[PDB]
Amino acid sequence: SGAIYVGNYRVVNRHLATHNDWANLVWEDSSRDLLVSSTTAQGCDTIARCDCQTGVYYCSSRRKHYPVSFSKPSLIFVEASEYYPARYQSHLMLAVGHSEPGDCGGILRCQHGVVGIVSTGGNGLVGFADVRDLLWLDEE
Ligand SMILES: C[C@H](C(=O)N1CCC[C@H](C(N)=O)C1)c1cn(C)nc1C(F)(F)F
Ligand SMILES: [Zn+2]
């Protein structure tokens, strides 16, 4: 579990969005596994606006932050799960690292701010949904 809190927005994995998130919806994209809801209070996370490929992510299944190298956001085939059929997930970045069901929502960060959140796992790889292209999170 986990979310990004920026301005008047809450960014979560779409597959883990609560009833309250859908009742206060701003934007959602199944192909990226992202959902953004509105908040009453202002958030303080800063979204990275960069092309970094090295960062640190939080892994709840190990209670540890790990430094990683990760790929550029791409359309990657993801195996069928209880949440989606087998499909290409867009804007996804992979790194060599531990992930397991329960780790989605963990933040990946670089020197510039938040890069994205854990969204996939398997075969000793961890996948992060990028948020650096959502420039609108920094406004209105
Ligand atoms: C099966 C699950 C996963 O990748 N997904 C389930 C949830 C929906 C995902 C998607 N975005 O499409 C695919 C997974 C397997 N490992 C080892 N770690 C995970 C994870 F970290 F929980 F994501
Ligand atoms: Zn960066």
Curated annotation (Swiss-Prot):
Binding site for Zn(2+) 1: 50, 52, 110, 112
Residues annotated as catalytic: 15 (for protease 2a activity), 33 (for protease 2a activity), 104 (for protease 2a activity)
Catalytic reaction annotation: Selective cleavage of Tyr-|-Gly bond in the picornavirus polyprotein
Highest taxon in the source lineage: Viruses
Chain's role: Cysteine protease that cleaves viral polyprotein and specific host proteins. It is responsible for the autocatalytic cleavage between the P1 and P2 regions, which is the first cleavage occurring in the polyprotein. Also cleaves the host translation initiation factor EIF4G1, in order to shut down the capped cellular mRNA translation. Inhibits the host nucleus-cytoplasm protein and RNA trafficking by cleaving host members of the nuclear pores. Counteracts stress granule formation probably by antagonizing its assembly or promoting its dissassembly.
Assembly mode: Homodimer.
The protein's name in its UniProt record: Protease 2A
Residues of the full protein shown: 869 to 1008 of 2193
